[PDB]
Write a structure and sequence with these properties.
part of a larger assembly; 5 chains; A mainly beta (219); B little secondary structure (49); C mainly beta (232); A: 219 residues; mainly beta; Immunoglobulin-like; four-stranded antiparallel beta sheet; elongated; B: 49 residues; little secondary structure; two-stranded antiparallel sheet; 8% strand; Spike protein S1 (chain B); viral protein/immune system
C-alpha cells in the first residue's frame, strides 16, 4: 500500500493558463524495469473516464498533445498547454505496482469563467404537499460562478442543520452557468409551529450575502 | 510441422520492450473479422491437412 | 464494452451475478479486471483475471476481502466476463467497471505482484442497491410562479417531484414545446432512500394568463405518466 | 423464340422479410436427366454482373447461403432470407437451350428502406449563362429515398414536357440515400417571355407535392 | 478476363475491332463468348465460340444478325479472342462482355442447338459510340448559393459543368480539402449528343463570407483545366 492523495478539493483553473497537479509516491518506482510505471487518467463525470498518459512519457489512445506528464522518483507532475470545456473531470496518478491497489482522490479542473451574480429563487410549499404532513421548501441559485457557496436555512434567526439537502447540476453547454438547488425537507409538526422562513446565500462574487425572507400562510 | 506457442512482444526497433508495448513494438497476433454479409474473399475456410 | 447486465436489490446475505458484454474484440488475448467506485472522488480495484492463451490462469491477483468473499470466472467461448460473490458486509454503492489491461504479453509475472500497462476499455451500466424498499409512485406538486429577481414582467415557475425510489425521465414542459429556460436538476438521496427532483422554467409574466404551462413526469419502472398544470 | 417475363419486376422490399421473383418459359424444359435447365443471374449496377445459382438447385462460385432457387415445370422463383445493402442489383432468368439466348427483361430492386425527406434546391440561371443565349434551371433533390419520384417543371402554371432530363447517383455507403437532379434547358427567347418558374417534386413520403418558386430579376 | 481493348467512335459503314485480354488463367480450354447490353432494360446474347481442344470442329453458334454482319476468330496460341464486325447496321451502344461458359465438356450438341451451363467471368471496359468525330471543352458556371433547404444557416453552392463531351469530367472542391457534403451527379445524354453535370456542396453561411470555395474541373480528352471560384 502506497499513500497517495492528489487534491481532495476543487482546484480553479482559468482558461488559457496551464494547470499542473502533482503526486508523490512513498515507495520508489522503476524497480521492475527502467521505464517509469505510472498511468494518468481523466474521468469526466457522467459517461466514462478517458485515458490520457500511460506508463512513461508517451502518448496513446488519441490523447491531445496538450497533456504532457513529467517527473521521476518522488516528484510527479502534469502539464496542460490549454484547458477546454471538455477537460472538466477528476484526475488520478496510478502506479503499476502494489497489487492491493489503493487509489487517490480526484482533482476538479473546471474552467474558471467570469463571475456572474446568482439569481436567488425561493419556492414556498404548496397546499397539496402541506396537507400531506410533509413540507418542503427549496432554495435555488441560477447563473452563478464559481460553484462554491455556503447555503444554509435560517428559521427565526436560528440555524437549521440535518434537515436540508444539496443538489447541483453539471456544466452548461451555452454559457457554462451552474444551478444550485438546496432542498429543505421538514415535517408539518415542526413546520406550522414556526412563522418566518428564510434562506441565506454566501458567495465570493457578491459584495454582501443575499438573504430572502418570507412568511408562511401568504400566497 | 512445428507449432511454437511464443506469444511475446516482437522487437522491431532498437528500443527493447520487456512487458510494455511501445510505438516500435507490436503484438505478432491480430484477431479475425467475420460477418455473414462478407464475400468470397472474406468467408471462413475450415482447412484440415 | 457496449452493454452489460446485472443489478437490482439484493439482501446482504444474498449473492450477485455480474456479467459484462461487448462486441467483436480480442476478448481472449486481453486481461480484464473489475473496478468499483465510490460516489465521491476515488475508485477501488476489486477483481482481475488472467488470459489462458498467454499462459496458465493460476496468477489471479486478489486482495483480502475479495479473496474471502469474491471470485471471478470466464466462459472462454464468447465475449462475457463473470464476477461472483457470496457475502456482502459493507457494499452500498458501486459501478463495477469492466475494464481491461493494455498488455497482450505476459512477462516476469508471479502470483503476487507484477506491473500492468494501461486501461482503456472502462465500462458502465451496473448499479447496485441494498435497501429492501421497493419502488414508489412519484408525487408531483406545482410550484406557484412569482415575479422575483430583477424582472417584474417575468416569472419563475416549476414542478416538484417527491417520494420516488427510481429516477424518472427529465421533466418536459408543455410536451417539449418550450425549451428556453427549462432546467432539470440531478436528484439527491433523502433520509428514506427516495430521491427528490425539482424542474424550473422561466416565462414572461405577460403570457402567464394566456399560456398554459404543464409539466410532464414519466416514470419508467412504475409506468406512471403525470401531467400537472401550474396555476398562480 | 422464347419469352421470359418478370412479373414482380417492380417491388419495394425492406430488409427483414423474404422477397420473390418469377420468370416464365414459353417452351417446356422438362427434357432433362435430373438437371433442370435454368439459372439465375444478379447484375450489380456499375462494374459487373454476378452468378448466383447455375442449372438445377445447387451451389457454385462462392454464392452466400441467403440466395436459393427452386422450381420444376412452368414455375420458377427465387427465395431470399433477408436482403441487405449489398444486394442492390437486378436479376435475370435464362434457360439452357435455344442457342440464340434471348435474355428477358429485368427487375428494379428498389429497397423499401425508411423514408428520407427530399431536400429541394433551386438553381436559377446565372448572368454569364444568360449571355450565351441558353438559360438552364436545375431542381435538386438531396438525400431523398425511395429512388422513385416525379419531377415536373411548371412555367406560368403550365406543364413542360420534352425539355427536362434527370440524372441520379447510386446508393450511398454512409446513409444510402439517393439524390436526383433535373436539368431543364431553354433558349433565351423562350426564357425572357415568362417570369414564373418553379419545379414540382412528388414523393412517396410526401402527402402533397412541394413547389419551390422563383422569379427572374433577382440575384 | 482482366482488361479489355477497344472503345471509340466508328462509322456504321466501317469495320469494328473488339477483343478480350486475359492473364494467368485456363483460357485456352474453355468456350468464351460475348455478351452485349442495351441502355434500356434487357440484355441479349450476341456471339459464342468453342475451342479446338474439345474437338477438331469449332461448333460455331450464331444468331441471325451476327450470322449476317459478325464473325469470330481464335488465336489458339495466346490469351486473346478476336471479334470483328464488317458492317454496322444498327448498333448504338454495347458493353461487349467477355463472359466464360462454365461447361468444360461438350455433349449432345449439334450445329443448331447446344446447352450452356452458366457464366461467371463477366468483364467490363469496352464502350462503343457512333457519335460525332469531335469533342468539346467543358464550360463551368458558378451557381449562387441559396440558404433555403436543409439547415437555415447552410447554403448550397456548386459549379455547373455544361456542354462537354465525353462523360469523364472530374470536380474537386478546395483541391480535395472540402469533401463533406460534396455531391456529383452523373452525366446525362442530350439530343445533340453533348453531356451535362451538376455538382454542389453544402456549406454554412457563417463562413460563406470568409472561407473561399474554389472548384477544380479537369477534362482529360480535351486537356482543359478550369479553376472556378463560387461567390454569391
Amino acid at each position: 500500500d502506497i499513500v497517495l492523495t492528489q487534491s481532495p478539493l476543487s482546484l480553479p483553473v482559468t482558461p488559457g493558463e496551464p494547470a499542473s497537479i502533482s503526486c508523490r509516491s512513498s515507495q520508489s518506482l522503476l524497480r521492475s524495469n527502467g521505464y517509469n510505471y505510472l498511468d494518468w487518467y481523466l474521468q469526466k463525470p457522467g459517461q466514462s473516464p478517458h485515458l490520457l498518459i500511460y506508463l512513461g512519457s508517451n502518448r496513446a489512445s488519441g490523447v491531445p498533445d496538450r497533456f504532457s506528464g513529467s517527473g521521476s522518483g518522488t516528484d510527479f507532475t502534469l502539464k496542460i498547454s490549454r484547458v477546454e470545456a471538455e477537460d472538466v473531470g477528476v484526475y488520478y496518478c496510478m502506479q503499476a505496482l502494489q497489487t492491493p491497489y489503493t487509489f487517490g482522490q480526484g482533482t476538479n479542473l473546471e474552467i474558471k469563467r467570469t463571475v456572474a451574480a446568482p439569481s436567488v429563487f425561493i419556492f414556498p410549499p404548496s397546499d397539496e404537499q402541506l396537507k400531506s404532513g410533509t413540507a418542503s421548501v427549496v432554495c435555488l441559485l441560477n447563473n452563478f460562478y464559481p460553484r462554491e457557496a455556503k447555503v444554509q436555512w435560517k428559521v427565526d434567526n436560528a440555524l437549521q442543520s440535518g434537515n436540508s439537502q444539496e443538489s447541483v447540476t453539471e456544466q452548461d453547454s451555452k454559457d457554462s452557468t451552474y444551478s444550485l438547488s438546496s432542498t429543505l425537507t421538514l415535517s408539518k409538526a415542526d413546520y406550522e409551529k414556526h412563522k418566518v422562513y428564510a434562506c441565506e446565500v454566501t458567495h465570493q462574487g457578491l459584495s454582501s450575502p443575499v438573504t430572502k425572507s418570507f412568511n408562511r400562510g401568504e400566497c | 510441422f512445428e507449432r511454437d506457442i511464443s506469444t511475446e512482444i516482437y522487437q522491431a526497433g532498437n528500443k527493447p520492450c520487456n512487458g510494455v508495448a511501445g510505438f516500435n513494438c507490436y503484438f505478432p497476433l491480430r484477431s479475425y473479422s467475420f460477418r455473414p454479409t462478407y464475400g468470397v474473399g472474406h468467408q471462413p475456410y475450415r482447412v484440415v491437412v | 464494452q457496449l452493454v452489460e447486465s446485472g443489478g437490482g436489490l439484493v439482501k446482504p446475505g444474498g449473492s450477485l451475478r455480474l456479467s459484462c458484454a461487448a462486441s467483436g474484440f480480442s476478448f481472449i488475448t486481453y486481461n480484464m479486471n473489475w473496478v468499483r467506485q465510490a460516489p465521491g472522488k476515488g475508485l477501488e480495484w476489486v477483481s482481475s483475471i488472467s488470459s489462458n492463451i498467454l499462459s496458465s490462469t493460476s496468477y489471479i491477483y486478489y486482495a483480502d476481502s475479495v479473496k474471502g468473499r469474491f471470485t471471478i470466472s470466464r466462459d472462454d467461448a464468447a465475449n462475457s466476463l463473470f464476477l461472483q460473490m457470496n457475502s456482502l458486509r459493507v457494499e452500498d454503492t458501486a459501478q463495477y467497471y469492466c475494464a481491461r489491461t493494455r498488455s497482450r504479453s505476459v512477462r516476469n509475472c508471479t502470483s503476487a505482484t507484477c506491473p500492468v500497462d494501461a486501461f482503456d476499455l472502462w465500462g458502465q451500466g451496473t448499479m447496485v442497491i441494498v435497501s429492501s424498499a421497493s419502488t414508489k409512485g412519484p408525487s408531483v406538486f406545482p410550484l406557484a410562479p412569482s415575479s422575483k429577481s430583477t424582472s417584474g414582467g417575468t416569472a419563475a415557475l416549476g414542478c416538484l417531484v417527491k417520494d420516488y425510489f427510481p429516477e424518472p425521465v427529465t421533466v418536459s414542459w408543455n410536451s417539449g414545446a418550450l425549451t428556453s429556460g427549462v432546467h432539470t436538476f440531478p436528484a439527491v438521496l433523502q433520509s428514506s432512500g427516495l430521491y427528490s427532483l425539482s424542474s424550473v422554467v422561466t416565462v414572461p409574466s405577460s403570457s402567464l394568463g394566456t399560456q398554459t404551462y404543464i409539466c410532464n413526469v414519466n416514470h419508467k419502472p412504475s409506468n406512471t405518466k403525470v401531467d400537472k398544470k401550474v396555476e398562480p
